[model samples]
Target: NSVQQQLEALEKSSGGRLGVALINTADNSQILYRADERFAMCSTSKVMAAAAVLKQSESDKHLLNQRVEIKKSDLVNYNPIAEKHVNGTMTLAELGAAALQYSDNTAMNKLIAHLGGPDKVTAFARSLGDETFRLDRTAPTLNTAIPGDPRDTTTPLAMAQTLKNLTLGKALAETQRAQLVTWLKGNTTGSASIRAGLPKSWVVGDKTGSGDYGTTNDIAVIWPENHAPLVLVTYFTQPEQKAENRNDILAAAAKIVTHGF
Candidate 1:
């Protein structure tokens, strides 16, 4: 297949850990190599948080403009936005955008907390039709702690399912769906992953979640042609000692997305 050959070339060319998954957004039919295999879902899990919020909102439990305080401990990565706005407060939508767009850890935890914690999120994802996707139930923090179970996680299949449900307007209201989809489209992180494979002019709404110990992942909706869409989730890891190889592996994922089988 063209995608396999392209990835093979990328493997040889990049000589880094590489994995790729592509889903037909039209029908959720997937083509993958190593997609079911789980890897650490870094900030990419924020999409699940977004999904939870959307699901709850559909039931009239919450709204986007709701505000919450950013604790001092939540600012983990020299986050400028949090630094300027911390304790001052921000809306759920603002935190969600920061989490997805900047991959801000503290912001994500805040959004997760605002959504009634990770258990609510995990349960919501399962309710919305994702059996595998889950949020690890550790006390929230901004930086890395000891690694947790990979099973409390997701794959491209689950993420693509989330996207499919969102697109069909089955998961969230048309207004909420439009807003979350817009957030995903505006995601600026994960440039080296699936988002990097397409034209500069393309509108890609996706999220990337990365962690140390070689857990790097990305899930996204590709709009190379606004009408013809694709959902892609790519994941990769190196040896435990090779924790630094993530972005390098992500670059390989980008290559496959640009030229597929």
Candidate 2:
């Protein structure tokens, strides 16, 4: 009854748009919890691509600290700040951090290019077992280059797997896994969803996303809560309200779910 009550309250408060899932990162177990919830994977998709690189680094052993030119031409056409910084040179490490920390589209664009484009990342994703996704076949630096307008699409289960691999070290060598987890632990921007409900002292690793027509999404790892980490993903849309307001909805749900955990 309490679970139903919370879901009902969340439904009414959210205007009936919310989807969420919590997975035990230790095993492949899941807790499905939501409404008409398939969230269009906005920038959250970048996390997968980032993970792919880490996977490669595990195998290649030469990817860490590899430097690449950051030409002005390397900018992704989405956000303005990243566009200006792309032309300089940076290491693969920096690109990974900036891509997740600042959500720098341009940084990711360059990495995507160096990784041999969206198709390359798409193939890597499939190899890692992604079931539901699509890649737009445009250059990574153009405004028109979104893998798809909606970009990639994903369910909470897939998102959980992405984090699960990082947390469990399932997809990388020991060292590469350590570095990938370190990088994710440094990600501080998932404030809206998986983060809002966390304890200030707890370590939370995550990526947040926002996109056209009121989409707000987050995929994250909550640590030390139990024997292993818990993975959470929340996706929602509010057509009648400013997209940013969905952050508030995420905050509410996070507060409730974290308590349940």
- Cα displacement (angstroms), candidate 2, residue 53, comes to 1.3
lDDT of 1 by residue, 1-261 (tens): 576677667656654445577766566566676666555565677777766776667666567677777767667653556777866887777877777777766777776677677887888777777787777753233113124446445665666667667754488888878878888877777677765566777777878766555556777777765546777777665546445645656655665555642
List candidate 1 segments past 4 Å from native: 5-17, 26-29, 138-148, 167-169, 257-261
lDDT of each: 0.66, 0.66
Candidate 2 lDDT, tens digit per residue, 1-261? 454468557867767467677776566566566522355666677776677787778667678579877776555545444555555667788778777776778767766777887778778777767655555543232222122244556566666765676666566667777776686778766655666667776678778777655677777777864566777777766554344437777666666665655
Poorly placed runs, candidate 2 (over 4 Å): 25-29, 34-37, 76-87, 137-151, 225-227, 240-242
Q: Give Cα distance to truth, residue 26, candidate 1, Å.
A: 4.7
State TM-scores per candidate.
Answer: 0.83, 0.83
| Candidate 1 TM-score over all chains jointly | 0.83
